[PDB]
């Protein structure tokens, strides 16, 4: 079935990603990034501690229902 992944940025934004356990997290990152209007290389996604790979999946990272994903900004320079 569908899994609910809670993605949070740096504010009180609680978006619920209802995707499939076999759906690449790369698309999840892009979906959120596109909604914000930024480049996928301008931000960074992390799962608990380890950063998400461009080929990672909910079933790969052993993500459960109602899990959480952290979104950080890339340093200017």
């Amino acid at each position: 079935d569908h899994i609910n992944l809670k993605v949070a940025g740096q504010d009180g934004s609680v978006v619920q990603f209802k995707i499939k356990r076999h759906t690449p997290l790369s698309k999840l990152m892009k979906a959120y990034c596109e909604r914000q209007g930024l480049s996928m290389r301008q931000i960074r996604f992390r799962f608990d501690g380890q950063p998400i790979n461009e080929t990672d999946t909910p079933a790969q990272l052993e993500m459960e229902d109602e899990d959480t994903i952290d979104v950080f900004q890339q340093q200017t320079g």
Binding site: G12, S13, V14, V15, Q16, F17, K20, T23, K27, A31
Partner: peptide
């Protein structure tokens, strides 16, 4: 706080 639900479907 704001909550939005997004659904993504991928074809194998």
């Amino acid at each position: 706080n704001n909550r939005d639900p997004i659904v993504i479907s991928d074809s194998p």
